[PDB]
Hints:
Keywords: Bacteriophage, capsid, procapsid, viral protein. Bottom cap of the Borrelia bacteriophage BB1 procapsid, fivefold-symmetrized outer shell. The structure is cut from a larger assembly and holds 3 copies of chain A. By secondary structure, the first copy, chain A, is α+β, with helices and mostly antiparallel strands. Chain A contains 5 helices and 11 strands. Chain A has a 5-stranded mixed beta sheet. Chain A has a 4-stranded antiparallel beta sheet with strand order 1-2-9-8, with helices on one face. Chain A has a two-stranded antiparallel sheet with strand order 7-10. In chain A, helix 3 (177-190) packs parallel to helix 5 (222-234). Chain A is extended and about 110 Å long. Chain A starts with 41 loop residues before the first strand and ends with a strand. Chains in contact: A-B, A-C, B-C. Chains B and C meet through strand 1, strand 2, strand 3 and helix 5 of B and strand 1, strand 3, helix 2, helix 4 and strand 6 of C. Strand 2 of chain B pairs antiparallel with strand 3 (70-91) of chain C, so a sheet runs across the interface.
Amino acid sequence: MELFDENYYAKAVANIIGEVKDPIMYKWFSPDQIEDVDLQMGYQKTVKWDAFLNANPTTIANEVNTISTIGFSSEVVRLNYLKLQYKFRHLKQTSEKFYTSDSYIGDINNNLLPFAQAYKLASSEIIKLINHFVLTGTVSIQKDGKNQKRLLPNMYGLLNMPEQIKEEVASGDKDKMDKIFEKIEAGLSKLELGDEFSTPMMVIVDPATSLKLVKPYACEKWEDVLIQTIKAINNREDVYIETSNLLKHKILIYPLNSELIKFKPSKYMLPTPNEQVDKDSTDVAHSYIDFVLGGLLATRKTILQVNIKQS
Amino acid sequence: LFDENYYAKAVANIIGEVKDPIMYKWFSPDQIEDVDLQMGYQKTVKWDAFLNANPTTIANEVNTISTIGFSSEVVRLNYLKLQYKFRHLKQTSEKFYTSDSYIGDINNNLLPFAQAYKLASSEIIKLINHFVLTGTVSIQKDGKNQKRLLPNMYGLLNMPEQIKEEVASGDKDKMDKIFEKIEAGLSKLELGDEFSTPMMVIVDPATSLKLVKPYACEKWEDVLIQTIKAINNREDVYIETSNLLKHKILIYPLNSELIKFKPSKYMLPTPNEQVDKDSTDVAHSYIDFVLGGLLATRKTILQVNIKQS
Amino acid sequence: MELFDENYYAKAVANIIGEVKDPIMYKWFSPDQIEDVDLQMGYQKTVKWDAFLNANPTTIANEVNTISTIGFSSEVVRLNYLKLQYKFRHLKQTSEKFYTSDSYIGDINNNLLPFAQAYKLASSEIIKLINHFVLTGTVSIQKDGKNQKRLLPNMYGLLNMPEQIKEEVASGDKDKMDKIFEKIEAGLSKLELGDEFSTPMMVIVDPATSLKLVKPYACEKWEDVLIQTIKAINNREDVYIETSNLLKHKILIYPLNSELIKFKPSKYMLPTPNEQVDKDSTDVAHSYIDFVLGGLLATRKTILQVNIKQS
Lengths: 311, 309, 311
């Protein structure tokens, strides 16, 4: 600090409150892969039918009445949507006159802001949490990832979607892009796109993986080789590469086709203010924000996850 | 607002029946100036000029002229916000208690909102008067269990860097000794060029009783008035008695250039918008007020304490 | 100093500048006694005309042409006027938008003020100095009263006017109000008002003298006795008593009659801005203030000055 009136020299002041921006998860899906549903909390159920062979076929020679059978089975696919809410404190509207000036937007000492600024910041944080859920499939506020919120069944993300393809690169060969690409090729071969193979593909990588990819291939780059390999399986359609700081030593590959992977979020998924406002005789009020989680549906053996173990 | 909020309408209709604070009689109209503040502080900057040397004679040619300097002094006055709560009858339920003579429950001591607000405001105004006179906030006759206040929040009696005189307990009933202490304090008063101003004296009832005794056919009150006129350029001297003082004598000038009262414009009791409601017929209301804002020049107040022990 | 943002709580700013008030010297003169003159420096000569009777009047009976005469006389008095100047620094006009906020007037760190406020403060100080000169007749800025500026001849105040009544109370009787009153009686006896005795009188005393006066007379007061004594000689008209901190162990008694004492100040005696303004490439400018001293006129033996020697 200073021992003279340093406040006299503060000729102008600037406040950065940010701005609520579109979720980055929109870049992970195609426009036709997202369809909103009107359900704040509950489930959506669909029925699918399948057939299978029980034994080898029967030879029709002479007389026979015991014939091998073809069995059928039904499956119920259920999507769970869960409502969640947060609470934040702010300045009462009739108190901004006494708690706000032309040089201060709020109470800096006690970190108390007007409703608009507080709501904007809280909405940004909640949208970050929603993006993390849609990617990883878990809800936690810790870097370790522990103390996760216990969620309902059939609430998965791209990374934890079950019955998909997972490859594991060893800790010793972490620097070895040849081993990494070998694992990627193995997973890509294990991919099963069926009749929907002719579709654009999306790859999401971490910054370290991007740095390793932009190295020369053991001219042509590892990224070019990977793009050609993915084109070979998607019938030489568009292959997009995106870097995400959310992932760490993870490579996610999946098709941008609505028939294989679909997203049916609630129309109230994104943060919404609540009508209840807590007021008292003081100058502090409380408000609530609601958001809905759940709605990612995917086919098996259509998502490839390459994890580069560090130990 | 009056169509939607009944409590605001009632406060507006009854606000004229609240008596004026008695602290107004301790100041001149020019001494009081409101400020727009609720809680925080107000920096007051006083600018002064001084002469560096004797003036320069303008004769023939000269380039070196005597200079006039400038200086500033910064004063910080703290203001504090305080609140009270009281219970009252509900407007929609008053009709079930409107007796022919009055409204309310004598058995349960439950009053209509207007009367309850008036009485609470009167009590809070009395507390504010006590604070302004003494500088402490308490509800006991002993004056103890004082509420802790912020620094730079002073009253007339506890203002620092002023003149303090103390009369020993042995001389507790000797008006000659008390007047000797008063003369010493008046001599030590420093009013400078602003000495031509009316003066105000505030005494406790015991001192008021002792003043009307014959002078040791003249009275001690007359002697004191003449002594103060000897220093205030023979202008008005006013004498007041307050039951809020105990063996204290306060002497200070009524000059806006030396002592200034800059209270918040929300100092007097004000209703709060929040009203507690439930399913019963009892509701709660809140009254806010603000304390602080006395500014005095150094060595301009004489405070005499007559020790009882 | 508080380690939190205490400037946030500074929600009100009040700036005390004062105001150029009327000089206190006006209280020492009647409205008719003051008459402005048009001068800045030098000397002005005033002629007083006078008449007298040479003999007893002549009875107009029958024929006569030898009549008694009325003669005339003149007296010339020279009054000196001195011009004095002061200089003060202030903010340049174009720098006010950069050096003045809504909560500031000027540089509190450098004590730099705009022209209007600086001029007002300087004018107040100069008016105080002018009052001191008019009362005492000397120019000084020290409480001791030393380092006096040498002044022109025929430039006097009330206290140092020559050819007046001067009484001295010895150091042994510096605390004897009876001796002081004896000296005052002697001076009042030596006063010479002539036919203008029916006039209000003015007395100026120091704070110590006022303290002594309010003492009981040795139930009457010394002040009451003095007022009665003065009323004995002024045809029982008004007697005003004033106290001034500019005096020290001095008592001044004089009539408020324009026929005996007059004040003819220059019409530029009070502070006036000068046209010259110092400017440079910086944000600091300088200005000058002019004032004129002199113009007290008194008849002989109409002022009583009592000095109480301290040692």
